[PDB]
Amino acid sequence: AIINLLRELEIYGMQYANSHQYTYGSSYSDDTNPIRIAGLDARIPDPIVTDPVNHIVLDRRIITNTTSNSLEGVFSFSNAYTSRTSSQTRDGVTAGTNITGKYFANLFFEQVGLSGRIAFEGAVTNENKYTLDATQDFRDSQTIRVPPFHRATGVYTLEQGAFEKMTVLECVVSGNGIIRYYRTLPDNSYTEIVQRVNIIDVLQANGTPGFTISKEQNRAYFTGEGTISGQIGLQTFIDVVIEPLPGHA
Numbered sequence: 001a002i003i004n005l006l007r008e009l010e011i012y013g014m015q016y017a018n019s020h021q022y023t024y025g026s027s028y029s030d031d032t033n034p035i036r037i038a039g040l041d042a043r044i045p046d047p048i049v050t051d052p053v054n055h056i057v058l059d060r061r062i063i064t065n066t067t068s069n070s071l072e073g074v075f076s077f078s079n080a081y082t083s084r085t086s087s088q089t090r091d092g093v094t095a096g097t098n099i100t101g102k103y104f105a106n107l108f109f110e111q112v113g114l115s116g117r118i119a120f121e122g123a124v125t126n127e128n129k130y131t132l133d134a135t136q137d138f139r140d141s142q143t144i145r146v147p148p149f150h151r152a153t154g155v156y157t158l159e160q161g162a163f164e165k166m167t168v169l170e171c172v173v174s175g176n177g178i179i180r181y182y183r184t185l186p187d188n189s190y191t192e193i194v195q196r197v198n199i200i201d202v203l204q205a206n207g208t209p210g211f212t213i214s215k216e217q218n219r220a221y222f223t224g225e226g227t228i229s230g231q232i233g234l235q236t237f238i239d240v241v242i243e244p245l246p247g248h249a
Contacts, residue, residue: 001092020181044228055160058079064152088128093171160234162229210222
């Protein structure tokens with residue numbers, strides 16, 4: 001689920017109130033040093049992808065030599081392939097505002113022995129699905145000698161990897177909250193107690209799961225979890241089949 005920092009602030013204030021014989025009035029983020037989420041990070045503990053790859057035919061062209069003389073041919077390919085990656089938070093945190101982060105990972109595709117750097121987007125602030133379409137511009141060429149009365153068929157292939165991985169989501173949580181309390185007095189009167197609290201003290205007091213606190217650095221480190229899945233072009237191949245035209249060898 002998503003830890004709601006404002007909710008934690010409210011919980012802290014309600015317990016503090018009962019504890020100090022006050023009446024909890026309200027609480028909110030401090031505008032001059034707001035409760036915030038920073039240093040968004042998403043890593044993949046198991047970067048070794050074992051999924052099979054698919055061989056996609058991006059293009060196929062033909063150079064035919066109907067002459068009695070050999071000739072040089074060149075296949076120049078350019079294909080912009082779009083691969084998608086999707087992420088989704090399972091255990092996250094939020095200060096009340098959704099934040100979309102950009103992430104990367106150098107995955108290794110064991111079945112072909114090739115690394116591929118993927119890119120993805122996601123929000124540690126909610127459990128919605130986030131997709132990112134990345135366009136790879138594959139450009140390759142191949143020179144070939146086409147014998148007399150032969151045809152050369154050049155096929156441009158893309159090796160596309162696929163993956164599904166768990167992610168460890170991280171970020172720094174810091175800032176201040178404001179809590180309003182009051183003591184009811186005689187003859188319809190009262191005295192209000194305004195307290196500015198450090199979010200790290202709230203999390204520590206609440207025992208909020210997923211955080212390690214650092215008074216030293218005046219911050220709390222959050223560790224959550226999610227998942228990502230997608231595909232990516234790993235490498236390309238140009239294969240040329242040369243063959244004689246009917247009535248030749």
